Amino acid sequence: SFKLILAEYIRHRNTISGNIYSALMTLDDLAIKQYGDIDLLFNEKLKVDSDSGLFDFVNFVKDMICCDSRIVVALSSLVSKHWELTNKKYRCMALAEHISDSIPISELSRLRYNLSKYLRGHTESIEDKFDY
Amino acid sequence: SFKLILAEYIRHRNTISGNIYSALMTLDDLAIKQYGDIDLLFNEKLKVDSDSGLFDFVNFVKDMICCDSRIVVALSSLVSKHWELTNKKYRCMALAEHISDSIPISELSRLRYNLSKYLRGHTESIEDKFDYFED
Ligand code: NA
């Protein structure tokens, strides 16, 4: 159910509406802090517009999921938006189902916990604490 | 473009017609010899209907992308067909562009070499030989 929220967000980042999705867009800031220029990362490093762009993107994020799903969710939604804006919506659909399905349960719970805290106004940002 | 012909075949195996494509369908027999019942490979071993089916399929064939495009092309086309028939056409399109572009130029030329021979009636089946310069 939270999986499905994540999938929906990644799949439809470009047009989607609702508070929970606006919340998730605040994760962009983490990706920007981490990589600096996202366009450069997408266009020059990963070549996301190439014929292998979907697979090269997933290969880039595959190990960092268990490090920080916040980053992977942010990057996946941004590349999905990029692909939708270049008529590769099919890649958005393929990415969303696989990223959402591949976040391990520990990391999924962690993301849900920190998002919940943000959504109730307990925290300024979506943090990375574990609910022990 | 030969590459684009392969992409078209994989993308649209379920509905595509034409001499080049019916020829590529003869490669199924290679896949069936290699792996046996394709349905079992797809449904039980690879679980291609799962949310990660696309990526699990690509991972399964990735070792052959470089060295045996006959089998990779056949299996990709067959799983594409399966996904079109189970309402996941978006997977057909993601698969076709990636597989077609990930086959090395030398293996491309090889497939083209053997396919042309088949289509010209010089061989009974689509072989796996190299021309003088790649052998
Ligand atoms: Na020939």
UniProtKB/Swiss-Prot annotation, chain A:
GO biological process: symbiont-mediated suppression of host cytoplasmic pattern recognition receptor signaling pathway via inhibition of IRF3 activity; symbiont-mediated suppression of host NF-kappaB cascade; symbiont-mediated suppression of host toll-like receptor signaling pathway
Induction: Expressed in the early phase of the viral replicative cycle.
Lineage, highest ranks first: Viruses, Varidnaviria, Bamfordvirae, Nucleocytoviricota, Pokkesviricetes
Gene name in the database record: OPG176
Function noted in UniProt: BCL2-like protein which disrupts the host immune response by inhibiting the TLR4 signaling pathway leading to NF-kappa-B activation. Acts close to the plasma membrane and targets several host TIR-domain containing adapter proteins including MYD88, TIRAP, TRIF and TICAM2. In turn, blocks the host NF-kappa-B and TRIF-mediated IRF3 activation.
Top-rank taxon, per record: Viruses
Family affiliation: Belongs to the orthopoxvirus OPG176 family.
Molecular functions (GO terms): protein sequestering activity
UniProt keyword terms in alphabetical order: Early protein, Host-virus interaction, Inhibition of host innate immune response by virus, Inhibition of host IRF3 by virus, Inhibition of host NF-kappa-B by virus, Inhibition of host RLR pathway by virus, Viral immunoevasion
Protein's UniProt name: Protein OPG176
Assembly behavior: Tetramer. Interacts with host MYD88, TRF4, TICAM2 and MAL.
Key word Metal-binding present: no
Cellular component GO terms, alphabetical: extrinsic component of cytoplasmic side of plasma membrane
